[PDB]
Design a protein around this nucleic acid. Structure first.
Ligand SMILES: Nc1ncnc2c1c(C#CCNC(=O)COCCO)cn2[C@H]1C[C@H](O)[C@@H](COP(=O)(O)OP(=O)(O)OP(=O)(O)O)O1
Ligand SMILES: [Mg+2]
Ligand SMILES: [Mg+2]
Ligand SMILES: [Mn+2]
Length: 539
DNA sequence: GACCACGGCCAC
DNA sequence: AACTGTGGCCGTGGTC
């Protein structure tokens, strides 16, 4: 292109180079812009940001986050990645997109600006006529990128000293467990090495091997295997407690305090918008979509996520979301009725599983029902179900027969979805988000049946993900007008931060927005809670 | 140091 | 184990 001087005319496509992938931690090494056959390279990239009215180009949200970090309101606009991601959600990285639609992703801001321009022209062209995908782009993904940029730049407060103290406590408990494991093994070894543990359990000790690993065919030491060996030897019980504690310590307790941002004093994740095959978001660096909650220790970790002084956290979580979506997508009269009568299937399966009435179901029991209810729905085998619930085989088969007869039109929808996917090569959500599944006609059974379970899962999970994204787009402006903040999204959950005096009003309004985002044949119920910490806010 | 595959495991 | 699905991060063991 013809190199022209900075600044660029309005509407130009930006290219930028970061010192590291995390925009909140990155140094802006270079900045450029392309438009009208010209390329504009900025002398000083930081001051050159102030000249742009919009981040338009590849990975636009990342540059918008860095601008917010510097106190600049530079919103993200068009991004070829979002167009490619809607065309085919396997388009997840700029390296692939560039190769597939006419360019090369280099490490130079100018070339990245020119690439953004060329890729947008070609991808925008491939989308004309795909009115449903364009609707998703204009009404969901492009507006959503702006919401996510603000979430990423805002961050969440964390009780550092609390986790620091917790680490020392867990460390002492880990030493007690590993000391008994070594004694029981007769000698010490690296208990973190599953290869070394394999020998101790199955070679030195006489324990039987329950299963093999996928890629290398070693004797597995997974929780499901150790759980099956729980009575075969006392050492097994302690290895499971050792695994729980080292998992939480090495993944959450120790790394998270070291990630507080020096300017903000808060913890900043990244919400990746083109990372999943179903339309869900993902979270990384750090992932805040898998903070513990199951075990008592996991709850102590979740308590570390707190509200700023004078504020409160507001947590909103859709009820039985993918089951409600299934009712709407399938049209099953019976399942619709279940939610019109305010029934809760997780609680019901839980009572069934545990031989305990609804009133006596605790939060932990209900969680176990989710694996069952969603396991069965998405193709779980009778054999495994029997093994998970520790009950005979015929009983497990009976649960699955009862499950689907209760809602006959589900299997009809599954079959229509698969037949539709074989003819067109893709399945779609309620809004037209597509996932290509070419293995539906594979002539290897395992490969084909795997494709089938991914295929008919995507419309359900992806529709729920669509609803949440749309709700986030509608809610964000209402929160700014109330002086509240959107902090985290966990698939079907939102965590907000609100001034104490407006916390209750924010909770009400956020609940209404999420429930009336897009009415279905069943009502969307949202559970909401308020508290000083994340755990308190979901009760 | 930077990768990588793998087994394993946290969440939805 | 996996013959529910969607993710990302850990330590180990290995290569460069
Ligand atoms: N196992 C799954 N397989 C496939 N899909 C799944 C799950 C799963 C789970 C789980 C917990 N168990 C484990 O992680 C394993 O450990 C077992 C050891 O015992 C969630 N989803 C999907 C569908 C769901 O509607 C959506 C949001 O989730 P989530 O707000 O919590 O539920 P929900 O909205 O329905 O229900 P509530 O809000 O509580 O009303 O995510
Ligand atoms: Mg949830
Ligand atoms: Mg892996
Ligand atoms: Mn939910």
């Amino acid at each position: 292109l013809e190199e022209a001087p900075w600044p660029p005319p309005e509407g130009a496509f930006v290219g930028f180079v970061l010192s590291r992938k995390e925009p909140m931690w990155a140094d802006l090494l270079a900045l450029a812009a392309a438009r009208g056959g010209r390329v504009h390279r900025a002398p000083e990239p930081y001051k050159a940001l102030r000249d742009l009215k919009e981040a338009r180009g590849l990975l636009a949200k990342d540059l918008s986050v860095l601008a917010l970090r510097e106190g600049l309101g530079l919103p993200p606009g068009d991004d070829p990645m979002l167009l490619a991601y809607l065309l085919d959600p396997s388009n997840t990285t700029p390296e692939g997109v560039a190769r597939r639609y006419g360019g090369e992703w280099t490490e130079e801001a100018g070339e990245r600006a020119a690439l953004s321009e060329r890729l947008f022209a070609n991808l925008w062209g491939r989308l004309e006529g795909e009115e449903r995908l364009l609707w998703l782009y204009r009404e969901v993904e492009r507006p959503l990128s702006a919401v996510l940029a603000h979430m990423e730049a805002t961050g969440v407060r964390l009780d550092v000293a609390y986790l620091r103290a917790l680490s020392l406590e867990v460390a002492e408990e880990i030493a007690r467990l590993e000391a008994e494991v070594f004694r029981l093994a007769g000698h010490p070894f690296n208990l973190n090495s599953r290869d070394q543990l394999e020998r101790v359990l199955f070679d030195e000790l006489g324990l039987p091997a329950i299963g093999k690993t996928e890629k290398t065919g070693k004797r597995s030491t997974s929780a499901a295997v150790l759980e099956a060996l729980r009575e075969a030897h006392p050492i097994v019980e302690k290895i499971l407690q050792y695994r729980e504690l080292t998992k939480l310590k090495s993944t959450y307790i120790d790394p998270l305090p070291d990630l507080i941002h020096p300017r903000t004093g808060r913890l900043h994740t990244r919400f990746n918008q083109t990372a999943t095959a179903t339309g869900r978001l993902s979270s990384s660096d750090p992932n805040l979509q898998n903070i513990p909650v199951r075990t008592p220790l996991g709850q102590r970790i979740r308590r570390a996520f707190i509200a700023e002084e004078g504020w409160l956290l507001v947590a909103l979580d859709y009820s039985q979301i993918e089951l409600r979506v299934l009712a709407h997508l399938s049209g099953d009269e019976n399942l619709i009725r279940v939610f019109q009568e305010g029934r809760d299937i997780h609680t019901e399966t839980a009572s069934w599983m545990f031989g305990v009435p609804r009133e006596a179901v605790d939060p932990l029991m209900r969680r176990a029902a989710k694996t069952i209810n969603f396991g069965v729905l998405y193709g779980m085998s009778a054999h495994r179900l029997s093994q998970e619930l520790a009950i005979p085989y015929e009983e497990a088969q009976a649960f699955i027969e009862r499950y689907f007869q209760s809602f006959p039109k589900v299997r009809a929808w599954i079959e229509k979805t698969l037949e539709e996917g074989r003819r067109r090569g893709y399945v779609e959500t309620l809004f037209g988000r597509r996932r290509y599944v070419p293995d539906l006609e594979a002539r290897v059974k395992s490969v084909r049946e795997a494709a089938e379970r991914m295929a008919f899962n995507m419309p359900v999970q992806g529709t729920a993900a669509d609803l949440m994204k749309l709700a986030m787009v509608k809610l964000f402006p209402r929160l700014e007008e109330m002086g509240a903040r959107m902090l985290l999204q966990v698939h079907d959950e939102l965590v907000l931060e609100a001034p104490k005096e407006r916390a209750e009003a924010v909770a009400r309004l956020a609940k209404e927005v999420m429930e009336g985002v897009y009415p279905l044949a069943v009502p969307l119920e949202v559970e909401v809670g308020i508290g000083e910490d994340w755990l308190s806010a979901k009760e």
